Structures are given as C-alpha cells and as structure tokens.
Amino acid sequence: SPVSDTDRLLYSTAMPAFLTAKRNKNPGNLDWSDDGCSKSPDRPAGFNFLDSCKRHDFGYRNYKKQHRFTEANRKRIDDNFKKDLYNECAKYSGLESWKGVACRKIANTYYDAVRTFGWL
C-alpha cells in the first residue's frame, strides 16, 4: 500500500532506517527526490537539519503525488519535522548546553517557516 508504507516511513521509523530506505529507494513506487531544506541552509550554524528536511520533503512530495496534501495533513508532516529536528538537537551532550539549546531555537524557526510558507 503506497499510503501505509509512506506513513510507516514518515512517523514510525528512526532516521537512520529512513535514510537507508531513501538511499535504496525502497519501496521504488514512491517519490524519493529532495531539494534538501528547500533553500534555507542544510546545516544552519553547522547543525545537520538536512536529514529532517529530506524526510519533510518525502512527506510533502508523497502526500502531493498521493491524494491527501490537505492543510491538516501538512501540519502533521510539519510537526514530524520539528520532532526530527529536535531529535538531532538532542545529540548534543552535555556540555553543548549551548549547542542543544541553540539548535532547538533554530529548529523552531525552521518549523515556523514551513508552517507559514509550505503551502507554496
């Protein structure tokens, strides 16, 4: 099912396994292309936001190719993007008190931006 696999990969798959599925284009039937963070840097202040953007692009591109890119589905995909970004930020310990807090503040800005302009 194109929709059950999209949602599994979007909402119930840890990032490394999502990137593996991406790299292998598996399952082949769906859209695996991306423009990274759709011009906003991929690594703002040197933080890796590209993996989260890749998954956010997966969600947008596949819901559009599918029947369901509504405003309420767009928000579910945007919220999963802040989740993914916060997962990356939480990799700073402990120490980078600092990196984690700065990364989260920029993640909030990236999230705010997709909420506002993502319908384009």
Resolution in A: 1.9
Residue 106 is classified by DSSP as H
Q: Which among 39, 118, 44 has a CA at the least distance from the CA of 88?
A: 44
* Per-residue tokens: 39: 């011009």
* Single-letter amino acid code for the residue at 64: K
Which active-site residues does the annotation give?
56
User: Do residues 74 and 119 lie in contact, with contact meaning Cβ atoms separated by under 8 Å?
Assistant: yes
Angle of the 50-65 helix axis to the 2-11 helix axis, nearest 10: 160
> Which residue from 52, 54, 53, 60 is spatially nearest to 77, judged by alpha carbons?
60
Domain boundaries, the chain: 1-120
Burial 94-118 (b: 16+ CB within 10 A, else e): eeeeebbebbbebbeebbeebeeeb
| The domain defined by 1-120 carries CATH number 3.40.50.300 | no
- Tell me the CB-side half-sphere exposure of residue 81, using CA atoms within 13 A: 29
